[PDB]
Design an enzyme around this catalytic site. Structure first.
Site, PDB file in Angstrom:
ATOM      1  N   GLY A   1       0.813  -0.887   0.297  1.00  0.00           N
ATOM      2  CA  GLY A   1      -0.033   0.077  -0.122  1.00  0.00           C
ATOM      3  C   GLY A   1       1.021   1.455  -0.500  1.00  0.00           C
ATOM      4  O   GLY A   1       1.933   0.769  -0.143  1.00  0.00           O
ATOM      5  N   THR A   2       0.174   2.955   0.053  1.00  0.00           N
ATOM      6  CA  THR A   2       1.080   4.097  -0.107  1.00  0.00           C
ATOM      7  C   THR A   2       1.310   3.837   1.024  1.00  0.00           C
ATOM      8  O   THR A   2       1.405   4.037   1.760  1.00  0.00           O
ATOM      9  CB  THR A   2      -0.559   4.821  -0.636  1.00  0.00           C
ATOM     10  OG1 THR A   2      -0.822   4.652  -1.467  1.00  0.00           O
ATOM     11  CG2 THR A   2      -0.330   5.793   0.459  1.00  0.00           C
ATOM     12  N   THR A   3       2.663   4.868   0.630  1.00  0.00           N
ATOM     13  CA  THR A   3       3.399   5.390   2.072  1.00  0.00           C
ATOM     14  C   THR A   3       2.502   6.418   2.943  1.00  0.00           C
ATOM     15  O   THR A   3       1.951   7.381   2.399  1.00  0.00           O
ATOM     16  CB  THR A   3       4.289   5.651   1.658  1.00  0.00           C
ATOM     17  OG1 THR A   3       5.971   6.182   3.111  1.00  0.00           O
ATOM     18  CG2 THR A   3       4.617   6.583   0.436  1.00  0.00           C
TER      19      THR A   3
ATOM     20  N   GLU B 280       0.907   9.355   1.476  1.00  0.00           N
ATOM     21  CA  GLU B 280       0.851   9.735  -0.284  1.00  0.00           C
ATOM     22  C   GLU B 280      -0.449   8.980  -1.113  1.00  0.00           C
ATOM     23  O   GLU B 280      -0.740   8.149  -0.603  1.00  0.00           O
ATOM     24  CB  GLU B 280       1.920   8.874  -0.677  1.00  0.00           C
ATOM     25  CG  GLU B 280       2.111   8.443  -1.890  1.00  0.00           C
ATOM     26  CD  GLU B 280       3.130   7.063  -2.572  1.00  0.00           C
ATOM     27  OE1 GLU B 280       2.857   6.913  -3.704  1.00  0.00           O
ATOM     28  OE2 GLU B 280       3.854   6.957  -1.934  1.00  0.00           O
TER      29      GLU B 280
END
Lengths: 244, 111, 198, 244, 242, 233, 250, 243, 241
Positions: D30-32, D47
């Protein structure tokens, strides 16, 4: 999920048989043999105690013959603990009936109820059936002396003479050979011992390996009496019948 | 002890003409000898050309009218926007009221 | 209350029950049969609360008929009465108890003897030569205590009841509109269609 | 044998719970997102990958508030994140209702911890597919926390999870060393905007949207608020500038 | 094993798809909707000559303005019919009017996906999907005559004509070419009778096939054998006429 | 691989995937195409209705949830009915209790959460339907895309279903254009129909095959089918 | 959540065996040896305190437990299973008997209760049988002294003397040689100590051995005086010292 | 058949693999702890390892204050450790409310052990991969150490150790007691008992400790508390001025 | 709590548990029913795997649900009891609420419903039973004969058989039963029934029981002799040729 570990104890085989029932019966077939013989003046219940030791207390023991009512008793073949569960509910049903109608429960009614309970574990609930077979010996004023049998499937039938447990095939053939409608309780007691005697997987047939009971209507009274023989009582009858 | 009911006065009137119908009501809302409002609408347009008024205990009247309007809304949702005929609304209202047969909406309702 | 009477003679049990059904100011019916056959040889009469009365009777009837079919056997009068007593004894401690009193008259084919059971709404059961519920006993028991004999014939029993009914028709304030009489014996249950002037 | 990784609460021979570990994979994919603890508060940043021009800018908010003083951000399966916050909210309301005072960050962390750990106890549920960074200000200071799918959590100086967690962690460790006295809320906001831009290299393929929130005793009164307008742009620039 | 509400890699529910297979094995059922009413016909298909054919009830009444035909594991349709009759009667009690055909259908289809061993959505206590499809036909003031096909999937389609059961692909192809917006009730009847005859293994007669219809004027009626026999004869004649 | 980890939604694959959810997503792709786009005054839903036979009807794909909200479905119709019905109640609750129309953003959050519960527990199954929600609330026009995975997103426009990628690239291109079609519904609708035809292939949108719905400033969510959509074919 | 294991975990195999009961019995076989001997005026049950570490305090772990003031129990197999069985036994003695008849249950009946608890773990949904075999010794007015064995299946049988666990086969054989119906309690204790010595590898003393008897009433262990009919418990755990004193006369 | 290894049912050898594997999980943290009894106190030592520089060292602990008097150190994953701690605190509080006095250390231990025995018998509950060491100065028993494992087993100890290098610590302690001939550290101050604890920790593990490499808990009459980095440093300094 | 879906669909569209339920019926002792012009006769065969039974008490194959209706079956005996009890209970309930006994079709539709229900409820297996239900509707003289099976499907027959070798005996009936002229007599009806059973019972005077049901609750079972007499007269019909 859990589904993974479910044995599904209540399904049909491609042939239409109930796995668990068949396997429970297989289990019963290794249990000490129990015999029931119905005479004109009474009934006899005899059972061979599976496994024994010098140290086993036989005076305080009972693993095959249980009193359900004052007029009904059963011989057990299978898991003792499973039997006790059923025995206890049977004892309660008898009392409920008595309280409701103020009459002792007819033998078949009690046998049908117990078989119905067994049948249940066969169609729903996902639980293993009881690894037990019963031989019922009882009396009521509608059919007099009766002898029934019920197994894991929840099916029950009536008999003049019958056996459950190990070597029933051999036992049945012997009974079907010497049984006679006009038999007498004393004749029956002897037939029972002889039959067990020839089907035992043990050396000899001693008293310490037996349990005996009779349901007679003692002439000098007019009522029905259940007699669960005591060790010495079995030892006695063992000699008399010529098995010493 | 607690009394779940009250009386807000008011009087409403419904007259059916040959091809029209009117439902009137005073706009006074009271409590005992005090006026709560000189203008508190008591007759409502519930859609599908149906006007309704539940007079008596105002809290009950509001609950009912509100429940009925919501009934019209779902009637549309569940029956392909079919129009709720006046006779059908009447039967529907009977069930709304009878639903509280043992703890009634203390109102006299007219549509 | 309604008139519910019962007498046990030599070979039968006789039940007499008033025919009127009064609701408030009016007598709505004068041909009401306050009885239900529980089995070929067992009859039950009843009196009490308006709706409970028949609902209870029919409920018991349903249960006995079901037992008869399941066992292909007819329960003894004593067995049937104990079942009924238990039902009432449960009801008395429930939310809304059955306010029903009953007389159970049956002929026991095994003992070959008629039996009469009296059970009130509390589950109070007693077996008797004759019995009643309500005020009925107050006017008739002195007559029954006098003329009753264990060896009476069905005909003698009917004459004794007739006497009881006459006393009831003389001293009781309410017009119960006569009674319907039924005999229960070794051959079953039959109704005496002629008591309006026997 | 094998199959130890098919059911959720099962221990493998080496004592691990593979399903929890697989959940972690969903998290790393997943997104950071990150969190930075400052001298009197905490900052949260994430993010937001711009899948297409069709996504209305600034509309799909990912950071969530709990009660009025807590912020939560997470990487992994977004729905699972919301699920965990909804619970945290009930958990926070319950605590306030009973104790009057808003829930302390440590107490809150454990509430989330026990709940997440609970989902690793049975095979009837799946572990949470998210790692959650959350925190706020309370009776005695600011607190930052990160919670793994195992239910494991600790207090942090700085924290990161998702695709670019390594970059972020690296940057965070620098700050920790170069600021033993403590960063300020104002600075942390910028620093945070940078770390996210940097860590965006591990996903430099898609364009993204920055999102920041903070809770500072002096800057927001100890209440959680989203960084908007000027303060946001100023941080965007600070990052865009140091990315070259 | 595998859950009864599992998705296949194609995005289909195994149990529902396997359910459709059982329906394919069922007796044929056909419905034709005309501005003069809707005809519903079915293939009795008794399994032995000793079976009294008239006891085969594959066409039942839901209400005076709604009837329905089934195909597949017909025993599974009893509770569906029951729910339908109750929905229609209940609607009338609550609204003093007839329930719209579409509404009645949607209600029946709501039972469809209520199966599983503990699906998180409500309390769907039913171990498997229904193994029967239904043709619901009726009339109402807002949309006139209608024919609906309700499947164990929960979806229902409105058709001008439709065939379900063993001979459906064939019969449907036929219906495609035979149906037109101006068919008369009589044309529809003969038409249903003809297609049934083409797909039925047995030679169609008034004992192994049954007709019915629903008209605004007289509602749902099941044609007694004598009535259909004549229609059979009339069909043989029109066919032999060219 | 997959086969050992796709038996139910409560199981993660070794890579952190939820196959049952992905298979559900596949049911959407197999669904007929539908489009959604909005300006600042309106929001439009354009859906291609699919028919079984030429003797069957074209199944409805637009459901009204309230006077200011509605959606289009792609996938299992029954699941759309369940989800839309839940949305109807939520809207209804908001009105009755707070006398407030439900924010489209809030509806998206509620749908996300309802779908999520069916992806973390044993026994259930993910929903197998995609939804496009449009509505006009206190912050203007809105369009949302709902995926069975529980992921809901707000966009200016989008499309789901078979060949949806055509319409989606068209909108991503026509963006600057339609986003400014304020005060002119017919123009927004035509724009929507132009985007949807970008996913045609089989046939061409006919009268009993096209389905449109709009909501906006002074326009209560309304559906147009048949004759009423003729002026757009 | 919610235990969804509502089906049996113990079922019949084609041969008719009940797998889990069997396996449970195997667990019992690996357990430390324990035995019981019935004398004419008492009963003795004993086992070895297999301290899992010298840092452990073997006294804080009792393998011999008092169920009622006239009944005690010892086991072989899984200690934790035994511990909960004892809690349940002590409680059932009250709920199913003392609170009804105002007196403690007779040995056979309490044994019957325990056995039921065990049988149920053999058939109820979601559980495994108990991995233990118990030896229960007690006394009651109408039955005198008694000794019972209860196995994982729920089956129980009365014994004059027996042993379970590790060296049960050998120990049972040794008991058959020394047992007679005229043994006095001290004799039984002595025989018990001898039998247990063959099973113990290391140290053999009052600190490594746990032994209790069911004998005469101990008015000194009652805690109060004033009720003539209350004479004290018949159950008594021997002290480390009491054991050693008897070990010298070994 | 092969599932007798996934849930807690017997294997043909009468074993419960899941319980065994749960034991494996207890060493997952690679931490070692030990406990000793003073003359009137109880001490528990536990290595503290904070690898990540981004962690707030103050929040990393495996020691818990269960009640005013009971302390508990856990060997195993932190999430399962916190599950046990919460339950133990709730059980401790409820006991006081119902029975009128403070729950004894050994009783809380038995209670937790019983709960564990159940996950061992019921299929839907998994065992917790932890070992719990409870300590206090019981009002009836004095200094006390009771430890429970995933098998539902528990017992009292004169002293004990847990973790990867459990054996080395145990034999070290054993030797000391074979020598002293008594079952506790004959010291009047807990400070010295803590020092003894750390000293033998070092000897047995062959490692030196800074103030942030340890974690300490002390139980005294009516109170159990944990030491601070500084309280510890003062401890380390003292042992240094002896070697 | 146990609610596992035991009866589910397989890829080819079958429900094996219901299918295997039928296999249990094929294994049961044969049962037959034939309706005359003014009666219905039910015949059942008696196994012989074991013989030394007490016929007085051993449960019979034909059961009365009410005074005007009977039920016979093939399949699991224990299972049939459950259906019979429910049927008897439903018969009394019907009389109590409608004030009229059940029609044969109603009673049949009820039993069938119970069977169908056990094919799509969690945690239960289908009944391994098939039934033949016969009798006369209240105040009606037209004979009724119905049959039910595990799936829950039911229908009426002029004559029908179930159980082992029912295939054989059905053929016999299909080429021995004329709907034009049904056994106009209680006697010729009972005969046709015995004949069909002899095709499979293989000489079994004590292995063949028959029950005759006439209008108005007139139901009676024949004795060994009465039946044995039919057998005798039948073996002659053959030899006399």
């Amino acid at each position: 999920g859990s589904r993974r570990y479910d044995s599904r104890t209540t399904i049909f085989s491609p042939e239409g048989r109930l796995y668990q029932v068949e396997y429970a019966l297989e289990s019963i077939s290794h249990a000490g043999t129990a015999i029931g013989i119905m005479a004109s003046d009474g009934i006899v219940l005899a059972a061979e105690r599976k496994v024994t030791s010098t140290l086993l207390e036989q005076d305080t023991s009972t693993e095959k013959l249980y009193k359900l009512n004052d007029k009904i008793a059963v011989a057990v073949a299978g898991l003792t603990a499973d039997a006790e569960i059923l025995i206890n509910t049977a004892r309660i049903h008898a009392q409920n009936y008595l309280k409701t109608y103020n009459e002792d429960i007819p033998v078949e009614i009690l046998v049908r109820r117990l078989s119905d309970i067994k049948q249940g574990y066969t169609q729903h609930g996902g639980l293993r059936p009881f690894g037990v077979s019963f031989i019922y010996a009882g009396y009521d004023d509608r059919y007099g002396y009766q002898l029934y049998t019920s197994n894991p499937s929840g099916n029950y039938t009536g008999w003049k003479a019958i056996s459950v447990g190990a070597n029933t095939s051999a036992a049945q053939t012997l009974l079907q050979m010497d049984y006679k409608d006009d038999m007498k309780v004393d004749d029956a007691i002897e037939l029972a011992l002889k039959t067990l005697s020839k089907t035992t997987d043990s050396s000899a047939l001693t008293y310490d390996r037996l349990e005996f009971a009779t349901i007679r209507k003692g002439a000098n009274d007019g009522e029905v009496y259940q007699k669960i023989f005591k060790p010495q009582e079995i030892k006695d009858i063992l000699v008399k019948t010529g098995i010493t | 002890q607690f009394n779940p009911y009250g009386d807000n006065g008011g009087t409403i009137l419904g007259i059916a003409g040959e091809d029209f119908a009117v439902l009137a009501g005073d706009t006074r809302n009271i409590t005992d000898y005090s006026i709560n409002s000189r203008y508190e609408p008591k007759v409502f347009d519930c859609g599908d050309n149906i006007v309704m008024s539940a007079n008596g205990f105002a809290a009950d009247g509001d609950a009912l009218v509100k429940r009925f309007k919501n009934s019209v809304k779902w009637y549309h949702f569940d029956h392909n926007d079919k129009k709720l005929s006046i006779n059908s609304a009447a039967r529907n209202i009977q069930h709304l009221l009878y639903g509280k047969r043992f703890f009634p909406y203390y109102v006299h309702t007219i549509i | 209350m309604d008139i519910i009477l019962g007498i046990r003679v030599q070979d039968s049990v006789i039940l007499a029950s008033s025919k009127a059904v009064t609701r408030g100011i009016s007598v709505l019916k004068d041909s009401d049969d306050k009885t239900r056959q529980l089995s070929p040889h067992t009859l039950m009469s009843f009196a009490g609360e308006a709706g409970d009365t028949v609902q209870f009777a029919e409920y018991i009837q349903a249960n006995i008929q079901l037992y008869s079919i399941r066992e292909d056997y007819e329960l003894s009068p004593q067995a049937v009465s104990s079942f009924v007593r238990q039902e009432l004894a449960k009801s008395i401690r429930s939310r809304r108890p059955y306010q029903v009193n009953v007389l159970i008259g049956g002929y026991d084919k095994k003992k070959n003897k008629p039996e009469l059971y009296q059970i009130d709404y509390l589950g109070t059961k007693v077996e008797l030569p004759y019995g009643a519920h309500g005020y009925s006993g107050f006017y008739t028991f002195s007559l029954l205590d006098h003329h009753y004999r264990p060896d009476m014939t069905t005909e003698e029993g009917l004459d004794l009841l007739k006497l009881c009914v006459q006393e009831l028709e003389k001293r009781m304030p309410m017009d119960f509109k006569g009674v319907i009489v039924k005999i229960v014996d070794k051959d079953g249950i039959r109704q005496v269609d002629d008591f309006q002037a026997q | 044998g094998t199959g130890y990784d098919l059911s959720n609460s099962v221990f493998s021979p080496d004592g691990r719970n593979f399903q929890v570990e697989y959940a972690v994979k969903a998290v790393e994919n997943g997104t950071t997102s990150i969190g930075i603890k400052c001298n009197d508060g905490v900052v949260f940043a994430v993010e937001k990958l711009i899948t297409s021009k069709l996504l209305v800018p600034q509309k799909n908010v990912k950071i969530q508030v709990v009660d009025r003083h807590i912020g939560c951000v997470y990487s992994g399966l977004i729905p699972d994140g919301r699920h965990l916050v909804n619970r945290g909210r009930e958990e926070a309301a319950s605590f306030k209702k009973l104790y009057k005072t808003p829930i302390p960050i440590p107490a809150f962390a454990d509430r989330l911890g026990q709940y997440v750990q609970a989902h690793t106890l049975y095979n009837s549920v799946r572990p949470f597919g998210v790692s959650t960074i959350f925190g706020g200000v309370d009776k005695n200071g600011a607190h930052l926390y990160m919670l793994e799918p195992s239910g494991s959590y600790w207090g942090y100086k700085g924290a990161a999870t998702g695709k670019g967690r390594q970059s972020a962690k690296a940057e965070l460790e620098k700050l920790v060393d170069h600021h033993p006295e403590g960063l300020s809320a104002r600075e942390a906001v910028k620093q945070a905007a940078k770390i996210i831009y940097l860590a965006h290299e591990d996903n430099k393929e898609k364009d993204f949207e920055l999102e920041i929130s903070w809770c500072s005793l002096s800057e927001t009164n100890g209440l959680h608020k989203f960084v908007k307008g000027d303060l946001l742009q100023e941080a965007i620039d600070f990052a865009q500038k140091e990315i070259n | 094993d595998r859950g009864v509400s599992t998705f296949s890699p194609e995005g289909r529910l195994f149990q529902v798809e396997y359910s459709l297979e059982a329906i394919k094995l069922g007796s044929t059922a056909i419905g034709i909707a005309t501005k003069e009413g809707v005809v519903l016909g079915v293939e009795k298909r008794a399994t032995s000559p000793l079976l009294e054919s008239d006891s085969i009830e594959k066409i039942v009444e839901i209400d005076r303005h709604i009837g329905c035909a089934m195909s597949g594991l017909t025993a599974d349709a009893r509770s569906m019919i029951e729910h339908a009759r109750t929905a229609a009667v209940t609607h009338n009690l609550y609204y003093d009017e007839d329930i719209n055909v579409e509404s009645l259908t949607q209600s029946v289809c709501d039972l469809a996906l209520r199966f599983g061993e503990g699906a998180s959505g409500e309390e769907r206590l039913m171990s498997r999907p229904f193994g029967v499809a239904l043709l619901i036909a009726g009339h109402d003031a807002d949309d006139g005559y209608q024919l609906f096909h309700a499947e164990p999937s929960g979806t229902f389609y409105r058709y001008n004509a439709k065939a379900i059961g063993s001979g459906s692909e064939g019969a449907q192809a036929e219906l495609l070419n035979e149906w037109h917006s101006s068919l008369t009730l009589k044309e529809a009847e003969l038409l249903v009778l003809k297609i049934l005859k083409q797909v039925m293994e047995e030679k169609l007669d008034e004992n192994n096939a049954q007709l019915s219809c629903i008209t605004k004027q007289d509602g749902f009626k099941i044609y007694d054998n004598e009535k259909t026999a004549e229609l059979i004869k009339e069909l043989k004649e029109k066919e032999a006429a060219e | 691989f997959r086969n050992n980890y796709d038996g139910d939604t409560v199981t993660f694959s070794p890579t952190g995937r939820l196959f049952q959810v992905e298979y559900a997503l596949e049911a959407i792709k197999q669904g007929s195409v539908t489009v959604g786009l909005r300006s600042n005054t309106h929001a439009v839903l354009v859906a291609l209705k699919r028919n079984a036979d030429e003797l069957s009807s074209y199944q409805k794909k637009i459901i009204k949830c309230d006077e200011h909200m509605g959606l289009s479905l792609a996938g299992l119709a029954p699941d759309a009915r369940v989800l839309s019905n839940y949305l109807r109640q939520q809207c209804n609750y908001s009105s009755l209790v707070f006398n407030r129309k439900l924010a489209v953003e809030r509806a998206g959050h509620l749908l996300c959460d309802k779908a999520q519960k069916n992806t973390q527990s044993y026994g259930g199954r993910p929903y197998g339907v995609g939804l496009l929600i449009i509505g006009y609330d206190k912050s203007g026009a809105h369009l949302l895309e709902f995926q069975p995975s529980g992921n809901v997103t707000e966009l200016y426009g989008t499309a789901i279903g078979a060949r949806s990628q055509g319409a989606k690239t068209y909108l991503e291109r026509t963006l600057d254009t339609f986003i400014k079609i304020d005060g002119n519904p017919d123009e927004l609708i035509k724009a929507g129909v132009e985007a949807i035809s970008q996913s045609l292939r089989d046939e061409s949108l006919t009268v009993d095959n096209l389905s449109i719905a709009i909501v906006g400033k002074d326009t209560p969510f309304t559906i147009y089918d048949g004759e009423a959509v003729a002026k757009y074919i | 959540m919610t235990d969804r294991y509502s089906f049996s975990l113990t079922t019949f195999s084609p041969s008719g065996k009940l797998g889990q009961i069997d396996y449970a019995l195997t667990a019992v076989k690996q357990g430390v040896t324990s035995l019981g001997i019935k004398a004419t005026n008492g009963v003795v049950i004993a086992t070895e305190k297999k301290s899992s570490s010298p840092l452990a305090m073997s006294e804080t772990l009792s393998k011999v437990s008092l169920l009622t003031p006239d009944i005690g129990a010892v086991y072989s197999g899984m200690g934790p299973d035994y511990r909960v069985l004892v809690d349940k036994s002590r409680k059932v003695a009250h709920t199913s008997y003392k609170r009804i008849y105002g007196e403690y249950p007779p040995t056979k009946l309490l044994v019957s209760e325990v056995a039921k608890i065990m049988q149920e773990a053999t058939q109820s949904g979601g559980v495994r049988p108990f991995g233990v075999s118990l030896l229960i010794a007690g006394h009651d007015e109408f039955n005198g002294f008694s000794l019972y064995q209860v196995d994982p299946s729920g089956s129980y049988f009365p014994w004059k003397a027996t042993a379970i666990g590790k060296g049960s086969v050998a120990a049972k054989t040794f008991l058959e040689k020394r047992w007679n119906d005229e043994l006095e309690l001290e004799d039984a204790i002595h025989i018990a100590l001898l039998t247990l010595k063959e099973s113990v590898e290391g140290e053999f003393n009052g600190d490594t051995i746990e032994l209790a008897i069911i004998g005469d009433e101990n008015p000194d262990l009652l805690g109060y005086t004033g009720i003539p009919t209350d004479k004290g418990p018949r159950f008594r755990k021997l002290t480390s010292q009491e054991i050693n004193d008897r070990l010298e006369a070994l | 058949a092969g599932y007798d290894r996934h849930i807690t049912i017997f294997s043909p050898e009468g074993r419960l693999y899941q319980v065994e594997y749960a034991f494996k999980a207890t060493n997952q943290t690679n931490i070692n702890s030990l406990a000793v009894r003073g003359k009137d106190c109880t001490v528990v030592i536990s290595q503290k390892k904070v690898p990540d520089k981004l962690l707030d060292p103050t929040t990393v602990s495996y020691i818990f204050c269960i009640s005013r008097t009971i302390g508990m150190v856990v060997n195993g994953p932190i999430p399962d450790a916190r599950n046990a701690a919460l339950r133990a605190k709730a059980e401790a509080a409820e006991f006081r409310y119902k029975y009128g006095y403070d729950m004894p250390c050994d009783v809380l231990a038995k209670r937790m052990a019983n709960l564990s025995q159940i996950y061992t018998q019921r299929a839907y509950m998994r065992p917790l991969g932890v070992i719990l060491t409870f300590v206090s100065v019981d009002e009836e028993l004095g200094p006390s150490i009771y430890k429970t494992d995933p098998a539902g087993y528990y017992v009292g100890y004169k002293a004990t150790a847990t973790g990867p290098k459990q054996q080395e610590i145990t034999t070290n302690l054993e030797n000391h007691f074979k020598k002293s001939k008594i079952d506790h550290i004959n010291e009047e101050s807990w400070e010295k008992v803590v020092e003894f604890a750390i000293t033998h920790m070092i000897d047995a593990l062959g490692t030196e400790f800074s103030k942030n490499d340890l974690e300490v808990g002390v139980a005294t009459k009516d109170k159990f508390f944990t030491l601070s980095a500084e309280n510890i440093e003062e401890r380390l300094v003292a042992i240094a001025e002896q070697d | 709590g146990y609610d596992r879906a035991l009866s589910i669909f397989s890829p080819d569209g079958h429900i094996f548990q219901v299918e295997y339920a039928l296999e249990a019926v094929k294994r049961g002792t044969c049962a037959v029913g034939v309706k005359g012009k003014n009666c219905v006769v039910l015949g059942c065969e008696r196994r012989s795997t074991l013989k030394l039974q007490d016929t007085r008490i051993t449960p019979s194959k034909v059961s009365k649900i009410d005074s005007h209706v009977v039920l016979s079956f093939s399949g699991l005996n224990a299972d049939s009891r459950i259906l019979i009890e429910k049927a008897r209970v439903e018969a009394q309930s019907h009389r109590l609420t409608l004030e009229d006994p059940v029609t044969v079709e109603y009673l049949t539709r009820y039993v069938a419903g119970v069977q169908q229900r056990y094919t799509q409820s969690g945690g239960v297996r289908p009944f391994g039973v098939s039934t033949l239900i016969a009798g006369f509707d209240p105040r009606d003289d037209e004979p009724k004969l119905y049959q039910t099976e595990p799936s829950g499907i039911y229908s009426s027959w002029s004559a029908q058989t179930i159980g082992r070798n029912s295939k054989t005996v059905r053929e016999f009936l299909e080429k021995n039963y004329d709907r034009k002229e049904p056994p106009a007599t209680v006697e010729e009806c009972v005969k046709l029934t015995v004949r069909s059973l002899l095709e499979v019972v293989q000489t079994g005077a004590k292995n063949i029981e028959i029950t005759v049901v006439k209008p108005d609750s007139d139901i009676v079972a024949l004795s060994s002799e009465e039946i044995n007499q039919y057998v005798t007269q039948i073996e002659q019909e053959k030899q006399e040729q």
